[PDB]
């Protein structure tokens, strides 16, 4: 089981926002051009659901609205089918029988022939499948073979939707690395739920995430994590983006912990505008099975100096070493160049680190500006 | 300063329409479930907007 500091760092990510619904472009505009704006799409979702309910009830206007929506949806679907058929015909016309090929992944420079093993990664373009496939690259691979081991699948959907309105956003990601000796299986799933919309109430969203990790030969143990987060806007004002989350982590051999080490954490997140300061805060507390760790992150901005960015972090171990960190960032434009500076100060170790990045695209004036290391470099025998 | 001797500040009078008041008094929204549900939906939307 990882230390409580890792869990406290995971929980204190910052201000969060769950993913909303997805909307079709043909149905929303009834065959007309539309633009992008949130609040007007979830309104369309809930409005069409309510109008369907009222039409079932018997209101003639709801029936008329639903009939118009159905006509627009049918026209859009037929148009898309015709477009798909035309695209397939055009693809057949261009290449008579030859399926389209894909560009191989470029690994980089090496003493082996750079053009070698390119034929292995050049495959025919796949069909319009829902899943997405990505290759995973290991740190060190075989000397005389390709260094790509394993694969990862990514999938997204919005099921339980009627005519493109409503549904439950759902994301899945599975990384699988299987060989004759080892086995690495990492799965993650996200589910979104919406309770109300600004026209019909407040913005109430609940996100449930579940991630499990299995490493068969090395660890021989599996890990499960389940987190539920609730977000609501304007709890103590016009807009505060209040959020509260609860996470449970288990390291049992299988299924239930069965005496496995458990951990429970809770996090709170809120942003507030006081005077000239727009402060965003996220504070979490985690307890493993019996030390307890605390974490807090804050982002502070000053409207009179928009170029300066200030972040504060406070981490407390079990009672009780408190680590405080302050980070400041600034940017400016030099003569034909841009310089960005970052200062990080830690009081636990009493240390200050200053980094200045420089980019010049007009000439090499900055190169002639800095020449000390050349003289500083000595043979020394 | 003659208002010092006599100052009668009368205001805050609220005038309510007789017809509208009678019409909305004759409406029974709570004796039936469907009427209550419709009234709740309309009340939510109206209070929101």
């Amino acid at each position: 089981l990882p230390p409580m500091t890792f869990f406290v760092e995971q929980m204190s990510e910052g201000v969060l926002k769950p993913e909303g619904w997805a909307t079709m472009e043909t149905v929303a505009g009834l065959g007309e051009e539309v633009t992008e704006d949130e609040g007007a799409e979830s309104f369309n979702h809930v409005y069409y659901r309510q109008m369907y309910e009222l039409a079932v009830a018997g209101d003639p206007w709801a029936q008329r609205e639903y009939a118009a929506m159905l006509r627009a949806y049918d026209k859009g679907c037929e148009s898309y089918r015709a477009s798909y058929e035309e695209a397939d015909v055009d693809a057949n016309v261009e290449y008579g029988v030859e399926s389209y090929v894909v560009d191989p992944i470029d690994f980089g420079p090496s003493f082996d022939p750079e053009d070698m093993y390119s034929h292995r990664h050049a495959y025919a373009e796949a069909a319009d499948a829902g899943v997405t496939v990505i290759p995973s690259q290991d740190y060190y691979g075989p000397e005389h073979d390709d260094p790509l081991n394993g694969i990862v699948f990514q999938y997204e959907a919005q099921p339980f939707s009627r005519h493109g309105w409503g549904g439950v956003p759902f994301d899945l990601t599975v990384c699988c690395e299987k060989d004759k000796t080892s086995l690495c299986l990492q799965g993650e799933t996200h589910v979104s739920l919406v309770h109300s919309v600004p026209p019909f109430g407040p913005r109430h969203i609940t996100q449930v995430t579940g991630s499990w990790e299995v490493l068969r030969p090395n660890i021989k143990d599996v890990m499960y994590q389940l987190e539920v987060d609730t977000f609501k806007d304007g709890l103590l004002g016009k807009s505060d983006h209040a959020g509260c989350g609860l996470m449970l982590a288990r390291l049992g051999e299988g299924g239930d912990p069965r005496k496995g080490p458990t951990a429970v954490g809770v996090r709170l997140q809120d942003t507030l505008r006081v005077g000239p300061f727009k402060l965003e805060a996220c504070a979490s507390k985690v307890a493993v099975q019996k030390e307890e760790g605390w974490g807090a992150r804050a982002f502070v901005g000053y409207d009179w100096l928009p170029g300066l960015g200030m972040a504060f972090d406070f981490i407390q171990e079990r009672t009780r070493l408190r680590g405080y960190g302050a980070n400041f960032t600034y940017d400016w434009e030099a003569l034909g160049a841009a310089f960005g500076m970052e200062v990080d100060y830690v009081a636990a170790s009493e240390s200050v680190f200053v980094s200045v990045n420089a980019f010049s695209g007009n000439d090499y004036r900055l190169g002639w500006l800095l020449l000390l290391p050349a003289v500083n470099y000595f043979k020394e025998t | 300063s003659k208002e010092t001797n006599l100052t009668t500040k009368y205001k805050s009078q609220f005038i309510y329409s007789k017809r509208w008041k009678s019409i909305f008094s004759k409406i029974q929204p709570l004796q039936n479930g469907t009427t209550r549900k419709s009234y709740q939906l309309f009340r939510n939307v109206a209070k929101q907007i």
């Binding site: 929303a28 409005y47 | 419709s38 939307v45």
Partner: peptide, 29 residues
């Protein structure tokens, strides 16, 4: 009898909202 009145209001109000606020084509124009 005025049992239906609230319903006839609700089916109106949101509908009117759909025409005046949350209309993407109108916003685009």
């Amino acid at each position: 009898k005025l049992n239906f009145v609230y319903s006839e209001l609700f089916v109106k109000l949101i509908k009117e909202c759909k025409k005046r606020i949350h209309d993407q084509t109108f916003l685009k124009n």
